[PDB]
Structure 1
Amino acid sequence: GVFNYETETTSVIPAARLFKAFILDGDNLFPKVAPQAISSVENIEGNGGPGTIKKISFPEGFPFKYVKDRVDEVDHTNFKYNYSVIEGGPIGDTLEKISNEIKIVATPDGGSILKISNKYHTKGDHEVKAEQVKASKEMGETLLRAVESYLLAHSDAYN
């Protein structure tokens, strides 16, 4: 079945720039700005749209070795990005997939709001634990704050 988790967070970076950097260039940025969170991102297949497969490796000592993520949808107009965790890490005989939807919305102060949904698809029926949702939220927040710091410091990046 499906367990749905939703959260929101804010950024001081305008929505379009944040989307271009944090979403569209995460493969480059995450290992650069947050090497103690993500060791590397490998493009396995695909050119960035629906179906593109990436292997995300975690640093030594992390709970999981890697995950493979699949791009589901990329909406450049509405700053929506959907992707799924489809192999590795928590995926296996109790958890088939984690489907994620991110939307970035502008705020009038010049920042943005990020709306995040994480949908865990289980076999039957293997309760999803608060600790696992917390870890995903914490990773996302770490990556966001690292990218935000980089964007604040490199004004000519991603305009």
Structure 2
Amino acid sequence: GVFSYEDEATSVIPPARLFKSFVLDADNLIPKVAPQHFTGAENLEGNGGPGTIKKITFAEGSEFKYMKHKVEEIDHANFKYCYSIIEGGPLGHTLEKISYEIKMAAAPHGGGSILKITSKYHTKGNASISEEEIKAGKEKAAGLFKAVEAYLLAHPDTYC
């Protein structure tokens, strides 16, 4: 079964800089912003553009866990950024794929931004999606999104 879920999240980061950070620097941004929650991330394929693969990694209790996120599309006109689980352990075993789309928008105050995000859970066979799996997907992304603001306010000499 195909299951799409969309959210908007507010950021203190400006809309093009919100976009630019998650496309140009994410491999370093993950352990920059949350070094106990993630061990790091590494380029396995491409050049940071479409057809890129990021091996994203955590242990958080020393039990090592991995994802591979294929960057499928990057669109600088829309400031849209699309990737999926081509891999995330059990997300290949009873799920098959997770189709992401990060889209920026303006904040109403014009200071920071609104992050818009789709995550699309593809389940194997007739399997219904777990609410706890929908939550597990959101919480790692929302973890990094709140952590990059806290990082950017703690270490402001980055231009992003």
Normalized against structure 1, the TM-score is what? 0.90
Matches within 5 A, 1:105-120: 105-109=105-109, 110-120=111-121
| CA deviations over 1:72-124 (Å, ceiling 9, x no partner) | 11112222110001113232231111010111112242121111111111220
| CA deviations over 1:21-77 (Å, ceiling 9, x no partner) | 234311111112201222111111111121111111112448871111100111122
The question of 1:138 aligning with 2:139 is answered yes
Kept after mapping to 1: 8 A contact 2:38/2:60: no
For residues 23 and 43 of structure 1, the distance between their equivalents in structure 2, rounded to whole angstroms, comes to 12
For residues 23 and 153 of structure 1, the distance between their equivalents in structure 2, rounded to whole angstroms, comes to 21
Kept after mapping to 1: 8 A contact 2:102/2:117: yes
Kept after mapping to 2: 8 A contact 1:69/1:86: yes
Q: Which residue of 1 aligns with 2:153?
A: 152
Q: Which residue of 2 aligns with 1:97?
A: 97
Q: Which residue of 2 aligns with 1:72?
A: 72
Note the residue ranges of structure 2 that are not aligned, 5 or more in a row. Answer: none
The question of 1:50 aligning with 2:88 is answered no
Q: After alignment, is 88-97 or 75-84 more displaced?
A: 88-97
Q: Which residue of 1 aligns with 2:14?
A: 14
1:139 partner letter: K
Over aligned residues, Cα RMSD in angstroms? 1.9
Distance apart, 1:13 and its partner CA: 1.3
1:101 partner letter: E
Note the residue ranges of structure 1 that are not aligned, 5 or more in a row. Answer: none
Taking only the aligned residue pairs, the percentage that are identical comes to: 66
